[PDB]
Each structure stands twice: as structure tokens, then as C-alpha cells.
Design a protein around this ligand. Structure first.
Ligand SMILES: O=c1[nH]c2cc(C(F)(F)F)c(N3CCOCC3)cc2n(CP(=O)(O)O)c1=O
Ligand SMILES: O=c1[nH]c2cc(C(F)(F)F)c(N3CCOCC3)cc2n(CP(=O)(O)O)c1=O
Lengths: 49, 127, 151, 49, 149
């Protein structure tokens, strides 16, 4: 609200948020596999919608 | 509740471990001072062991890779332009010559003068 | 339903539209799987022939980088609309157990933060191409009337 | 006919479409945040635009 | 030591040079990934060697034979060191080889025929009624003038 603005044009740079983990952690590779699994199944686009 | 809550729920579903939704103390993302060289926020919680994993929109930079690791980005984004929605503005005096033309009216007036010259040349040269 | 649309006959695009969960894209995959005749093409150039010989009656779906590259090539008669449908991205590959992949990723982040990658993009996409400038607003905002009737 | 065409649809259009539209004019201004990585991006840029 | 860099002929990433018969070494090609690997070798400081894959395949695991082909299979069986190519980062490829962060994101767009302002001149004037009602109008005009005279 109040639905009064709009965004035009494409993106200007290559930005991206990802899951952070400390170095030397054993869970980073299964977390990355879970991120890839959620990306390929389109559930992230469903949550985006 | 929100996006990252369901994201952590999907992480715990597809990985099978208990989680603990905690809040950062200072409310900062992460920054390294030039003097103390001490990271703050969620970055400082991950470096100094105050946190275990951070599920939050943190910007993946080179200076943050030097202390901790990062996964692949789930949602890409970029720098955008914010303007207001163009509503109806008062057009005013420009409304009179607004439709069909901006320059062709002068051609209409010049052809009017030319046809008037032709009419005077025909009508006032018969004797 | 007038202007048809198709993808490539084999590849991960067909696996993406086939295994989609959105009902809109599900109806798209149902229409492209039940079209008469087949909207699928074998190569990219076959899709270019199928688009250019339809006079605005057929569209082709592809990657955004390839679409922006073809848009910047001769005869400069294509254009790319809409946002990205998926969060796809390419990265530098290395085998597992290699000691070089993390310094390679450090170099990738260094080239991304210094903006040299966007400079290479502007070099090999905007400057190398045979089309005009990125602003195609030459008589693309005609407000009132074409002057050819008046002429 | 054309005045009825203007009074029929009333399709309001945007004056600014691309990122080069900001450099193309000077009446409408534009800004970023006073401190942050956005200022580091626009400060250390190499593109003349 | 030396290092093997593999890729595939794709535009505009790997393109044939004009004097390809008159060139030698890694400078026989040109494009995006060539200068990308040049910047990587500049910021790291190693010698490389540009290679071309044989089968023309990117990477795929045949489930009947449980075998990978292309540059993925070249990296698994040790035929190459670092693959610098636009290879799609999927779930099935993470389990066999590693990947860096994505440098250029992309998506799926729509390609259309891009119509231009094809507005002709005099032929657009007699559009809205017909090109044949006007002749009957002129014929009825001259007929009514004959009636009046
Ligand atoms: O790993 C893959 N990487 C790919 C990379 C690219 C490119 F964009 F050139 F980098 C392309 N193209 C896009 C469309 O025009 C033809 C070439 C296809 C790829 N495919 C086949 P997919 O299965 O259809 O995605 C892969 O499998
Ligand atoms: O690591 C960082 N992550 C950030 C993440 C976000 C958000 F998008 F909310 F996730 C934002 N915002 C963008 C606009 O809405 C307000 C907050 C700022 C961030 N900043 C500050 P920057 O340096 O100016 O980018 C960081 O430093």
C-alpha cells in the first residue's frame, strides 16, 4: 500500500543472496545440495509468488 | 513468519535437523573495523561462534569469504530504479494542438496561404 | 492462443516445463505437448527459421543470454521481453577434491566486485554486435498519429 | 477520429524506461543511500555511463 | 606444473579467429571465456592450455551404463583440470564435481519477430471503407449531376 510506485528496467549488476555457514563446517555441502534441490523443484519460485 | 522461516523449514525438512530461530543483538548485518578487525552482526556471530548457521539475506562478498563460507545463491537480484506510478497530470494549454500532430499544423497553415495565393492568382487575373 | 510458442525438442528446458508446479506453465506444457503440428525444433537455427517465417505468429523460448546475443546480431529483427523465469546461472567448474577451486572462486568474486565482468559483457554484447544502441526509442513512442496519412 | 482515440483508451505511459534514460535527461533527478555498498559500486565503476 | 583447460566451440564464448591457420597456441581462439580464463590466470599466476572437447557434449550421465560424457566425464576420468565453459549447475553435477559461485545469472525469455513501424502512405488513406465503394460513390455522384443537368 498505497500501490503508488512501480519499478522499470532490468537489473544493473549481478547480486545474489545465499545461505551462509562458517568455514570448516560439515553441513555446508548438504545445505548446498538442499538449496539446489529447492531450486530445481521450483518451490523457491512458488514462495516468491 | 515470512520467507526465511519457511526457507528454514524446508532446510530442516530436506536435511533433518532441529533449528533455533535466534535474533542478532545489535541488529547489524556485518562489518569489519579498520582498527580492531572485528566482525559484528551475524558475521561476528558466525566467526566468534555465537551462532551456528545464518539463514538471512546477507550479501555474498569477497571480504566475507575470507572468514566464512557461502552456498549458491537461491534468488538472483540487482540494482533497480524506484519511481512513482505515472498518474493523470493536468495537460493544460498543450491540449489544443495535442491530437494528430505537433508540426503538421504549420504545414496546414502554409498550404492555406498557398491555396489562398492560388485563389487570388486565378480570381484576379481573368481580364 | 493466436500467436504460438515453442521450445527446443530435447534439453533441460523441456524437463523444466514438464516438471513444473505452476498451473500456468503446466497449461503451457500441456498445449505444447498437444499442439498440431509440433512446436518443437531440432536446432537453434531451425527455431530461428520457424520464428522468422511466421511474421509475428510464432515465438521461441530460450536462455536469456542467448536471446540477448541473437538480439545483438544481424538482421537486428528480434527482441527480448519479460523477466527471468528461473534463477539459473553458470559458474566455473572443477572436480571434487581439487585444491584450486576455492582460489578460483576467490578470483571470480574479485572479478565480480571490481566490475570487470560487466565490462566484458558490454564489450562482447553491446560493442561487438552489429545492431544499434541499447535505446530503441527512435519513433517507438508515437503519441498521436503517423504523418504518412497527412503526407 | 484521433481525438476520440485519445479520449477512449487513456493509456498513461512512463517517461523513463531504461538506465540510460537517467543520463539522457537532467530535469528528473535520482539518488542512492548516503552510505553502503551501492555507493561503493557506483564509486568504483569503470563504465562511462 | 601445467594445467589443462577444456571448452567447446560456442558463440560468443569460443570463436574461431580469422587467421586461425596463421596462429598458434592458446591464442588461436577468441571470445568471452578466453579472456575470462586469461583473467583467472592473471589473478592466480599459472600456465594453462586451452582444449576442445571431442564429442561435442556438455555433460550427461547415461543411466544404463552409469557413465558421464563430455567435459564432465573428462573431469571425472582425469582428462582435464579446469573446465571453463557455460555448464549448467544442476543437482546431479554437484555430486561428481565442484562449482564456483555463479558470475552471470540468466533466465528464460521470449523471442518474437520484433515488428517495426510498417506504416505506408497513400495506401493507408483509403483503408477504412474499401478500395471499391469510392468508385460507386463517384459514379452515383456523376449520375446525380446528370439528373440535375
Ligand atoms: O549443461 C548445459 N548447458 C547448456 C548451455 C547452453 C549455453 F547457453 F550455450 F551456454 C545451452 N544452449 C542454450 C540454447 O541454445 C543452444 C545452447 C544449452 C546447454 N545445455 C542444453 P539444455 O539441457 O537444453 O539446457 C546443457 O545441458
Ligand atoms: O550485507 C548487506 N545486506 C543487505 C541486505 C539488504 C536486504 F535487501 F534487506 F536484504 C539491504 N537492504 C536493501 C534495501 O532495503 C533496506 C535494506 C541492505 C544490505 N546491506 C547494506 P548495503 O551495503 O547498502 O548493501 C548489506 O551490507
Amino acid at each position: 500500500k498505497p500501490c503508488d510506485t512501480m519499478k522499470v528496467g532490468g537489473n544493473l549488476d549481478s547480486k545474489g543472496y545465499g545461505i551462509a555457514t562458517p568455514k570448516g563446517s560439515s553441513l555446508g555441502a548438504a545445505v548446498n545440495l538442499a538449496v539446489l534441490k529447492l531450486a530445481e523443484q521450483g518451490a523457491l519460485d512458488k514462495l516468491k509468488n | 513468519e515470512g520467507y526465511c522461516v519457511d526457507l528454514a523449514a524446508e532446510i530442516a525438512k530436506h536435511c533433518g535437523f532441529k533449528y533455533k530461530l535466534t535474533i542478532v543483538g545489535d541488529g547489524k548485518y556485518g562489518a569489519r573495523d579498520a582498527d580492531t578487525k572485528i566482525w559484528n552482526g551475524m558475521v561476528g556471530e558466525l566467526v566468534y561462534g555465537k551462532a551456528d548457521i545464518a539463514i538471512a539475506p546477507l550479501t555474498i562478498t569477497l571480504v566475507r569469504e575470507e572468514v566464512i563460507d557461502f552456498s549458491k545463491p537461491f534468488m538472483s537480484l540487482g540494482i533497480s530504479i524506484m519511481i512513482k506510478k505515472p498518474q493523470k497530470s493536468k495537460p493544460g494549454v498543450f491540449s489544443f494542438l495535442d491530437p494528430l500532430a505537433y508540426e503538421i499544423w504549420m504545414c496546414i497553415v502554409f498550404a492555406y496561404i498557398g491555396v489562398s495565393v492560388v485563389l487570388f492568382l486565378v480570381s484576379r487575373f481573368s481580364p | 492462443t493466436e500467436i504460438a510458442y515453442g521450445t527446443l525438442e530435447a534439453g533441460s528446458t523441456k524437463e523444466f516445463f514438464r516438471r513444473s508446479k505452476i498451473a500456468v506453465f503446466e497449461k503451457m506444457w500441456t498445449y505444447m505437448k498437444s499442439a498440431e503440428p509440433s512446436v518443437f525444433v531440432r536446432t537453434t537455427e531451425e527455431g530461428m527459421i520457424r520464428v522468422r517465417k511466421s511474421k509475428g505468429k510464432y515465438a521461441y523460448l530460450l536462455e536469456s543470454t542467448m536471446n540477448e546475443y541473437i538480439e545483438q546480431r544481424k538482421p537486428c529483427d528480434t527482441m527480448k521481453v519479460g523477466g527471468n523465469l528461473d534463477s539459473k546461472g553458470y559458474g566455473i567448474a572443477t572436480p571434487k577434491g581439487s585444491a584450486l577451486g576455492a582460489p578460483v572462486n576467490l578470483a571470480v568474486l574479485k572479478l565480480a566486485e571490481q566490475g570487470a565482468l560487466d565490462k566484458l559483457k558490454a564489450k562482447w554484447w553491446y560493442d561487438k554486435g552489429e545492431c544499434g544502441s541499447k535505446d530503441s526509442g527512435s519513433k517507438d513512442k508515437t503519441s498521436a498519429l503517423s504523418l504518412s496519412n497527412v503526407a | 477520429a484521433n481525438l476520440a482515440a485519445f479520449l477512449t483508451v487513456e493509456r498513461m505511459v512512463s517517461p523513463i524506461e531504461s538506465a540510460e534514460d537517467l543520463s539522457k535527461q537532467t530535469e528528473i533527478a535520482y539518488g542512492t543511500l548516503d552510505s553502503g555498498s551501492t555507493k561503493e559500486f557506483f564509486r568504483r565503476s569503470k563504465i562511462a555511463v | 606444473r601445467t594445467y589443462i583447460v577444456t571448452t567447446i566451440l560456442e558463440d560468443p564464448y569460443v570463436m574461431l579467429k580469422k587467421n586461425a591457420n596463421q596462429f598458434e597456441g592458446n591464442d588461436r581462439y577468441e571470445g568471452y571465456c578466453v579472456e575470462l580464463a586469461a583473467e583467472i590466470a592473471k589473478h592466480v599466476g599459472y600456465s594453462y592450455r586451452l582444449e576442445i572437447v571431442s564429442d561435442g557434449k556438455y555433460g550427461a550421465r547415461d543411466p544404463d551404463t552409469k557413465a558421464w560424457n563430455g567435459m564432465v566425464g573428462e573431469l571425472v576420468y582425469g582428462r582435464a583440470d579446469v573446465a571453463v565453459a557455460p555448464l549448467t549447475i544442476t543437482l546431479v553435477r554437484e555430486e561428481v564435481i565442484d562449482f564456483s559461485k555463479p558470475f552471470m545469472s540468466l533466465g528464460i525469455s521470449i523471442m518474437i519477430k520484433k515488428p517495426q513501424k510498417s506504416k505506408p502512405g497513400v495506401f493507408s488513406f483509403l483503408d477504412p471503407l474499401a478500395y471499391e465503394i469510392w468508385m460507386c460513390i463517384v459514379f452515383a455522384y456523376i449520375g446525380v449531376s446528370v439528373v440535375l443537368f
